[PDB]
Amino acid sequence: CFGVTFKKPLVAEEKTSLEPQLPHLQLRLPHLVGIIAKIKGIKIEVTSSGESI
């Protein structure tokens, strides 16, 4: 209109959510509980010698 140009109003997103990126250390000692559980049940068997004889 005349010399000036008119532009439409811009709609705005109401909310934003922040989810930052985190470094991944990738440690291996955690989630190894099964090995500890296996260590718990060694179960060495010893039979008395001389009771039979």
């Binding site: 291996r28 000692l29 190894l32 090995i35 500890i36 296996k38 260590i39 060694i42 060495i44 068997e45 010893v46 039979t47 010698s49 001389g50 039979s52 004889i53």
Partner: protein, 52 residues
């Protein structure tokens, strides 16, 4: 009831005891060694990860 016979019979019994005792001793020693080896293997496996 011969004097040699009731001695031969005791000679029979006086060797199976030694044989069985040797067998049981070997079984116990092997079981102990296997247990120690399993324990050391698991310990090494657990030990590497914490160092890393």
């Amino acid at each position: 009831n011969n004097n040699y016979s009731k001695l031969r019979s005791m000679g029979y019994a006086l060797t199976g005891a030694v044989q069985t005792l040797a067998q049981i001793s070997d079984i116990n020693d092997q079981n102990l060694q296997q247990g120690i080896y399993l324990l050391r293997d698991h310990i090494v496996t657990l030990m590497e990860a914490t160092l890393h």
